[PDB]
Design a protein around this ligand. Structure first.
Ligand SMILES: CC(C)(COP(=O)(O)OP(=O)(O)OC[C@H]1O[C@@H](n2cnc3c(N)ncnc32)[C@H](O)[C@@H]1OP(=O)(O)O)[C@@H](O)C(=O)NCCC(=O)NCCS
Ligand SMILES: [NH3+]CCc1ccccc1
Length: 202
């Protein structure tokens, strides 16, 4: 009996979204937790960047507070940062993109939807809000003729959200195996075993 709405995130929402992410995602996404991310303007800018694509969604409670967000942006088929902790995360994301091209799985797709930042207020977890946020994007995909939803998960819990919705894990990289320059960079808490790249054909 905790009602909420699912709404498109507007440009004026940037501040509220960042406030929520700082309380939750910035502290409790597993890589951020492992590194103890702290203040990070670069992740703020990173989070705001896809908003103008108009396919990022917020869950809002009966008090008008944001209790969940899924920030998404369009991702195109490829063709030929001072914050020292976020730099490591960014390098990991570059690395995955170097080792796995989602577009090889979908050779006839030019544009796909990329699920970038997913966060739900701890008090409201286990109610399927992340799933509701994810499904909302299907409406956008259908309107725009987008066929694939790609979500790189750094959490076993977000991977579970995607699995319930019928996403399949098309690439796994275990953190224990990520050793750029020969040494382990990340050792997040179990059950977060690795990067789980999830894809749905909607
Ligand atoms: C990942 C996250 C967005 C899921 O949101 P959610 O709305 O709770 O999603 P769900 O209700 O489907 O729960 C997913 C799974 O989380 C697990 N979970 C972790 N903590 C939980 C808790 N406090 N309450 C209930 N379930 C929890 C459960 O295994 C659950 O599976 P199940 O309910 O089907 O048995 C949320 O856990 C979160 O914000 N985590 C921290 C930030 C993060 O890791 N983001 C994703 C990085 S890719
Ligand atoms: N998709 C999750 C990856 C991630 C982890 C931490 C900061 C930004 C992005």
């Amino acid at each position: 009996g905790s009602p909420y709405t699912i709404e498109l995130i507007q440009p004026e929402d940037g501040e509220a979204v960042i406030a929520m992410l700082k309380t939750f995602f910035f502290k409790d996404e597993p890589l951020n937790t492992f590194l103890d991310l702290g203040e990070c303007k670069e992740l703020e800018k990173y989070s705001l960047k896809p908003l103008p694509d108009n396919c990022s969604y917020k869950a809002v409670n009966k008090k008008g507070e944001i209790i969940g967000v899924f920030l998404n942006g369009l991702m195109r088929r490829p063709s030929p940062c001072e914050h020292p902790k976020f730099k490591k995360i960014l390098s990991l994301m570059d690395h995955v993109e170097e080792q796995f091209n989602i577009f090889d799985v979908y050779p006839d797709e030019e544009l796909i939807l990329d699920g970038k930042i997913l966060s739900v207020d701890t008090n409201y977890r286990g109610l399927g809000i992340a799933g509701r946020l994810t499904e909302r994007a299907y409406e956008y995909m259908r309107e725009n003729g987008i066929n694939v939803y790609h979500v790189l998960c750094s959490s076993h819990y977000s991977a579970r959200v995607m699995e319930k919705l019928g996403f399949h894990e098309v690439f796994r990289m275990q953190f224990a195996d990520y050793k750029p320059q020969g040494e382990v960079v990340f050792k997040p808490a179990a059950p977060h075993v690795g990067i789980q790249v999830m894809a749905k054909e909607v």
